[model samples]
Target chain A: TRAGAEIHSLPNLNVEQKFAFIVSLFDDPSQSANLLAEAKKLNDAQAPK
Target chain B: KFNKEKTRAGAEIHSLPNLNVEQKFAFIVSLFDDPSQSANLLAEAKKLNDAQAPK
Candidate 1:
């Protein structure tokens, strides 16, 4: 189990795919645009404010 | 005011072809590094993963 410091930004990984990956973590896996939005909001937060 | 929400719609997944479960779980759990967001995200992830979440 890695922490944020250990998490690879997956810079090479497609953003849209990362977006989808996060959504799959959800049980229902259907709540999407809302999913990607939340993912964007979360992923974007990793950088400095 | 902006909205991809207009086009993408509900949980319409695109793809996650690269990372395997190990990397993905590590990545997911990695969200905890900040400490502040960790607790909250853990709570949400736990509930969302509905028990399947990585330990």
Candidate 2:
């Protein structure tokens, strides 16, 4: 899992950084919608057997 | 139950209390930006969740 490995490589974060990241994700309704759409595209591309 | 499992995995990400959000978000974006790995990951998660759902 490349993502898994990359995730593990992350350094320890502080509360402020975490909060900021969460806020950025939802700061704009349009941006949030686009983020979800991108995620959905990744999910939809893989059909389950 | 599928949604449940999906959210469960998502919540697990937060449990790692020290990751840099900017880097993490970028990493996620890179994965989804690619055409193959991200899609395969979703399929794998679906299969794992489906196997555990009650018959």
Candidate 3:
């Protein structure tokens, strides 16, 4: 169960991917504009690519 | 931000807000993807005032 614990404890996707994924979850595409912007900022600040 | 020298010298640690497990893993993996960067980042983290070197 160590591996399971490790997987369970693993952090969620980085900020960029998290944002993109969250935006994808949204029901409205229009709402994505802001989400996209937020994701871009996170990606730039952290991911840089 | 891109100062590898500072990073390698353990001078710059990326300060991220509190994140869940998934987020932390993703971030760490992303950093690890680039060995040079990861080394620098680890060094920086060690040097950071608030950061503790990750085991």
Candidate 4:
């Protein structure tokens, strides 16, 4: 089965969440590290500034 | 390692506040690469939620 099939079976996720999840599927380790760093930065950015 | 970072990132996302049932399901489902494994993940999440909801 493909991810598209399972994706609709679960609860809805926003676009950013969907893209972040997609990024996790990459074969490259450094790509994920970069994504994680970006995730952390985005999370922190949501706070009162 | 990519797996480790993925695990950490998954945890971080799950820890976010005010997640509804849908969001939780989506988050759990997203953790696995194989779509077929989604059922097992959902079941595990249900079991954990059931165990924790009592208190």
* Highest-scoring model, lDDT: 4
Alpha-carbon lDDT, every model:
0.39, 0.39, 0.39, 0.43
Model 2 regions more than 4 Å off: A1-24, A46-49, B1-33, B36-55
Pairs clashing within candidate 1: A3-B30, A4-B30, A4-B33, A30-B11, A31-B11, A32-B10, A32-B11
Comparison by TM-score, 3 against 4, better one: 4
Residue-level lDDT of model 3, residues B1-55, one tens digit each, is: 4345434433223344333345344434445444435553343223322232244
What are the DockQ scores of the candidates, in order?
A: 0.08, 0.04, 0.06, 0.03
Q: Best to worst by DockQ, what's the order?
A: 1, 3, 2, 4
Query: Could you tell me how far off, in angstroms, the CA of residue B4 lies in candidate 3 after the best superposition?
Result: 30
- The ten-residue window of minimal lDDT in model 1 chain B covers B6-15
Scored against the true structure, residue B20 in model 3 reaches a CA lDDT of: 39
- Cα lDDT tens digits, model 4, A1-49, are 4443333233344444444334343433444444444334333433344
Query: TM-scores, in order shown?
Result: 0.34, 0.27, 0.27, 0.30
After superposition, the stretches of candidate 3 with alpha carbons farther than 4 Å from their true spots are: A1-16, A19-25, B1-55
Evaluated at residue B20, the lDDT of candidate 1 is 46
Question: If both were scored by TM-score, which would come out higher, candidate 1 or candidate 4?
Answer: 1
Candidate 3 matches the true fold with a TM-score of: 0.27
lDDT string for model 2 (A24-49, tens) is 34444444444444444443443251
DockQ agreement of candidate 3 with the native complex = 0.06
Per-residue lDDT of model 2, residues B1-55, tens digit only: 2445444444543344444455345334434334344443333334333333456
In model 2, the Cα lDDT at residue A28 comes to 41
